[PDB]
Amino acid sequence: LVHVASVEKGRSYEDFQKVYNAIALKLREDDEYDNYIGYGPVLVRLAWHISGTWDKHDNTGGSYGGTYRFKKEFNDPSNAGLQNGFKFLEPIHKEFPWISSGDLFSLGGVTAVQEMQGPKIPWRCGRVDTPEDTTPDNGRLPDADKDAGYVRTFFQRLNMNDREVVALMGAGALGKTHLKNSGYEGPWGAANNVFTNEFYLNLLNEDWKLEKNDANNEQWDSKSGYMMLPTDYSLIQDPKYLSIVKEYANDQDKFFKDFSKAFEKLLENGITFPKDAPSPFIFKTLEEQGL
């Protein structure tokens, strides 16, 4: 498969900044969601999940086709809980009906990160909606109960190397796990809706204890009340990952620089961009516009 990027006919940078401004003003408004965590975390989880189905071998899956809108992917067990992110965005799609789904789902992700004080992420437009028969089968998103060998191997299918995997994984400082959605329960840290390098400092500085939970899944619990999944804990079990974890616990700006570069790569995998295409857009924040 080749998927070439097609810009929504007639639209420019100013059209997209209005969709951003709309998502961002609704984030500020619906701040009570999940015990005042807000929707920022579920929206970067939805953008990684629509992108994380990509297969580098045959170019199936990925953000391009906006196929999460279809039943098979929408009802994937690994996507449980993302329906709240979908319903949040649905009014914004009625307001700006010209934007494609893959462009809206991925721009929700970019807007959430910049509005939770994270790095600026360059974004590109052009994903085109594709038919129901292009919806990837379930079972391509990753399990939680596994080790660093499983992680290295899983992320090579999206051709992410070790540094890109540790940088991308830091976006778990955000939000919390929910027993009813995943069989796991608890937050990764204190600042769960501001973007910081806290995931790396917690993994190196806490006294983690392996325990089972009420769903019979294991997880690492610390004294502080935080939790990590087995796959997260793995990053300090592997020596290549552990050095990169140390670097980011000591330099939040190297963390932000590399997260940025990797998160745009994850959102553009599987998409061919012509060079008549617009350069990547750097959207301003509400604060930068005075809104």
**Would you tell me which residues interact with ligand HEM (CB under 6 A)?**
41-42, 44-45, 48, 81, 142, 144, 151, 168-169, 171-172, 174-178, 181-182, 184, 229, 231
- Residue 135: which residues within 8 A CB-CB, separation 6 or more? 65, 67, 70, 72, 73
Whose tokens are 């140390």? That residue is 246
Which amino acid belongs to residue 276?
Answer: D
**Do you know the residue count of the chain?**
291
Distances (CA, A) of 45 to 94, 106, 132: 22, 10, 22
- Could you tell me the smallest distance in angstroms from the CB atom of residue 228 to ligand HEM? 11
- Could you tell me the smallest distance in angstroms from the CB atom of residue 42 to ligand HEM? 4
- Taking the least distance from each CB to ligand HEM, the nearer of 39 and 96 is 39
DSSP notation for 22-35 = HHHHHHHHTTTHHH
The dihedral through the CA atoms of 259, 124, 55, 68 has a sign that is: positive
- Could you tell me the smallest distance in angstroms from the CB atom of residue 274 to ligand HEM? 27
Whose tokens are 């000591």? That residue is 250
- Residue 290: which residues within 8 A CB-CB, separation 6 or more? none
Among candidate residues 3, 54, 123, 188, the one labeled active-site is 188
- Could you tell me the smallest distance in angstroms from the CB atom of residue 177 to ligand HEM? 4
- Taking the least distance from each CB to ligand HEM, the nearer of 5 and 166 is 166
Q: 94-125 burial string, b = 16+ CB within 10 Å, else e?
A: eebeebbbbbbbbbbbbbbbbbbebbebbbbb
Return the structure tokens found at 37: 């965590």
- Give the number of other CB atoms < 10 A from CB of residue 149: 11
- Could you tell me the smallest distance in angstroms from the CB atom of residue 181 to ligand HEM? 3
- Taking the least distance from each CB to ligand HEM, the nearer of 51 and 100 is 51
Q: Is-catalytic flag, 49? A: yes
Q: Is-catalytic flag, 188? A: yes
- Taking the least distance from each CB to ligand HEM, the nearer of 125 and 151 is 151
- Taking the least distance from each CB to ligand HEM, the nearer of 121 and 128 is 121
> Which residues are known to be catalytic?
49, 188
